């Protein structure tokens, strides 16, 4: 019936580290969004700017899906007008965000015993990110007056940090997989669509 490839985003074997978050465009497919907001397998499911029960009745130009992995705490920050390490240095939604933030516990996949170190987040940066900007830089962060010259040291940090997920932690420290649906409404009179 030409259904949208939602499974490809949600059920991928591996997700991207939040500093290098992955982005997929959905197009040329009929999408039933209810099969997402009626699933209780998503522990958190947040919508801004739009009414979820009216998503199948709206007209979009663009539809983006950003996937990545963070920890339970930081899901707070995937929202308009939030602060903190993730919202400031990794992934920021603008205040006029119109879309939805879906996140679910991925303890049994992304947390191994002794730590899973493949998931990194950016821990130092000289300035905050603009909304929907991603940085994948590896430049050394100068925290002191002594210049760095690209050499890591006590005052010159590597800018990224592993999570080191372990399944025994509490839920706030446990890995959560996140998908952000971003929408682009069609400009039209209301007799046409909205």
């Amino acid at each position: 019936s030409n259904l949208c490839p939602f499974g490809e985003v949600f059920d991928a074997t591996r997700f991207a580290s939040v500093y290098a978050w992955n982005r997929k465009r959905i197009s040329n497919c009929v999408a039933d969004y209810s099969v997402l907001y009626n699933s209780a397998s998503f522990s958190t499911f947040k919508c801004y700017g739009v009414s979820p029960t009216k998503l199948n009745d709206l007209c979009f130009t663009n539809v983006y899906a950003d996937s990545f992995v963070i920890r339970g705490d930081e899901v707070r920050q995937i929202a308009p007008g939030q602060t903190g390490k993730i919202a400031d240095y990794n992934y920021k939604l603008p205040d006029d965000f119109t879309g939805c933030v879906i996140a679910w516990n991925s303890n049994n996949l992304d947390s191994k015993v002794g730590g899973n170190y493949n998931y990194l987040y950016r821990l130092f940066r000289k300035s905050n990110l603009k909304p929907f900007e991603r940085d994948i830089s590896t430049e050394i962060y100068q925290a002191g007056s002594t210049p760095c010259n690209g050499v890591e040291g006590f005052n010159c940090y590597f800018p990224l940090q592993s999570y080191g997920f372990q399944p025994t932690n509490g839920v706030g420290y446990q890995p959560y997989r996140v998908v952000v649906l971003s929408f682009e409404l069609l400009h039209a009179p209301a007799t046409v669509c909205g």
């Epitope: 170190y117 493949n118 821990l123 940090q161 592993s162 372990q166 025994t168």
Partner: nanobody, 130 residues
Framework: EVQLVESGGDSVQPGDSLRLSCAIS????????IGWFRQAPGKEREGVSC????????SYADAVKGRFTISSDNAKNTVYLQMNNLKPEDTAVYYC???????????????????????WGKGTLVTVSE
């Protein structure tokens, strides 16, 4: 489930020497970074020294190079910090912290900042006077 206890802090005089101890109790982390940080009254909690599980390499702040030394007995699961030629400006609360190491492009990174620690001890006073 994971605890860090500091010992050895007291009140000494300039030039004296102290040894601080940290008792490891519960580490499952395969690759980690252990460190001593210090907090002055009112100022910010800054880093003193660190040792990373990979390479077992030692890192020291500028203010303490040659005077201080960090070491570990992984057998006994303890981490020691020797402080020689103590100065009045070394007076602070000393915390034992630890965290995961960072893994990028095959290499391991052991940055020694408080923002990169997930486990903290309670601390112990060191005071240098008279």
């Amino acid at each position: 489930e994971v605890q860090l206890v500091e010992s050895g802090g007291d009140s000494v005089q300039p030039g004296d020497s102290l040894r601080l101890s940290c008792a490891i109790s519960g580490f499952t982390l395969d690759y980690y970074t252990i460190g001593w940080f210090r907090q002055a009254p009112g100022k910010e909690r800054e880093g003193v020294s660190c040792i990373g599980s990979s390479d077992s390499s030692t890192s020291y702040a500028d203010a303490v190079k040659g005077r201080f030394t960090i070491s570990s007995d992984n057998a006994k699961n303890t981490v020691y910090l020797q402080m020689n030629n103590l100065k009045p400006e070394d007076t602070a609360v000393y915390y034992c912290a630890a965290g995961p190491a960072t893994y990028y492009g095959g290499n391991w990174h052991h940055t020694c900042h408080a923002n990169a620690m997930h486990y903290w001890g309670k601390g112990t006073l060191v005071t240098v006077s008279e």
